[PDB]
């Protein structure tokens, strides 16, 4: 196994073309794009990206409006708790 | 029946400011500084500076009806200095020779609960 030793395996599908910076950046983003994250309600890692932004989990049969390349984009993940902070403070 | 207001006095390595204000401090009785009296940059925060700045304005606070004052001496504080400035106590001395009367004195130095990076580099200042 380990057919291509270099870590550029998902993006080995490109070959010699497209530079060395773009191929590496793509490897991280592409792997995140097809990754199975865990849908909140299903709590099972069955989610994929239907199209950029909307992701759905086969088991939970629910569509979560997540990020383009990951179920939970890093900035929103924080905003989540900041709304919770203001709200818990309000009452 | 009496009246008192807080002095909120500040000391400085560059220049001291004496800003007698009232209760909350939102409303300012009088503002004075040592630069406004002297004419040399080094003596703007000097020991003579404060003594000259008070008393010149003490009359305006007496006219404004605040005979009694509460001195809250403040050194630069925060990241640097911590201790009082050169011309700090001098200001109280000149106003105390004047009729102003002090009920309580407090330190308002903005001491920090785990401070931000101290200014200057790791070698400090190689003057």
């Amino acid at each position: 196994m380990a057919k291509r030793t270099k870590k550029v395996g998902l993006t080995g599908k490109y070959g010699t073309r497209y530079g060395r910076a773009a191929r590496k950046q793509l490897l991280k983003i592409e792997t995140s794009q097809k990754a199975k994250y865990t849908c909140p309600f299903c709590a099972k890692d069955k989610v994929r990206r239907t199209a950029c932004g909307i992701w759905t989990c086969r088991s939970c049969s629910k569509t979560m409006a997540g990020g383009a390349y990951s179920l939970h984009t890093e900035p929103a993940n924080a905003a989540r708790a900041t709304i919770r902070r203001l709200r818990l403070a309000r009452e | 029946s009496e009246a008192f207001a807080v002095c909120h006095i500040y000391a400085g390595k560059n220049d001291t400011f004496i800003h007698v204000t009232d209760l909350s401090g939102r409303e300012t009785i009088g503002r004075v500084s040592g630069g406004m009296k002297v004419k040399r940059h080094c003596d703007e925060p000097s020991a003579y500076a404060a003594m000259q700045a008070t008393q010149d304005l003490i009359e305006i606070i007496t006219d404004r009806g605040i005979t009694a004052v509460h001195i809250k001496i403040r050194a630069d504080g925060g990241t640097g200095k911590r201790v009082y400035g050169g011309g700090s106590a001098a200001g109280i001395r000149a106003l105390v020779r004047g009729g102003i009367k002090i009920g309580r004195i407090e330190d308002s130095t903005p001491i920090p609960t785990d401070r931000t990076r101290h200014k200057g580099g790791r070698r400090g200042r190689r003057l």
Partner: protein, 200 residues
């Protein structure tokens, strides 16, 4: 089709006729199929609700803010973009808003918006790569692809035109009050070049 940003269909009970009216909202990240967005003056700050910006507290993350009251959606709609209420000032019933670009503007408190960042973030980080991804991307937008640079075109067409050696021929900075045909270079540049990053 055109907007990378997700569009979310949400239906509300119509106040008059029994049938429910369906309204399309720019999707805020965290919206789930079956989420009940409670929307109104007394609606909470849970992510997804539509409420008067003045009632929203300071520092909140907001998307789809309205420029003037009841403009039905105006600022902060782009993928991954957000606005922050710096302060709900009551001095003139005007809430401060920090726009995604970072200017400081103000909106009447009666403006309304959705708490939560617009979904679809990180869209431009991935290189488009193959130009074909660009032909397909702009296949849902304007016919603005592919672009031909000014020094390439023959002189009868572009002001930058072409000399013997493909030289712009003059300075790109062109005044703000120039005739429509003239403004082809950088419009009214206040400082050209790359300086101390972009932060001062």
């Amino acid at each position: 089709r055109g907007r990378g940003a997700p569009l979310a269909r949400v239906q509300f009970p119509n106040m008059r006729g029994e049938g429910r009216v369906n309204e399309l909202f720019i999707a805020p990240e965290g919206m789930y199929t079956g989420q009940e967005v409670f929307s109104g003056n007394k609606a909470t700050l849970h992510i997804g609700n539509i409420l008067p910006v003045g009632n929203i507290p300071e520092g909140t993350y907001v998307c789809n803010v309205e420029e003037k009251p009841m403009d039905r959606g105006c600022l902060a709609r782009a993928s991954g973009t957000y606005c922050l209420v710096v302060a709900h000032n009551m001095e003139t019933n005007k809430t401060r808003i920090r726009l995604p670009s970072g200017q400081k503007k103000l909106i009447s408190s009666k403006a309304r918006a959705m708490i939560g960042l617009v979904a679809g973030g990180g869209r431009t980080d991935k290189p488009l790569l193959k130009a074909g991804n660009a032909y397909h991307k702009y296949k849902a937008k304007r016919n603005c692809w592919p672009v031909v640079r000014g020094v390439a075109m023959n002189p009868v067409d572009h002001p930058h035109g072409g000399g013997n050696h493909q030289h712009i021929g003059v300075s790109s900075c062109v005044p703000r009050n120039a005739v429509p045909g003239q403004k082809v270079g950088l419009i009214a540049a206040r400082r050209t070049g790359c300086s101390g990053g972009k932060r001062r």
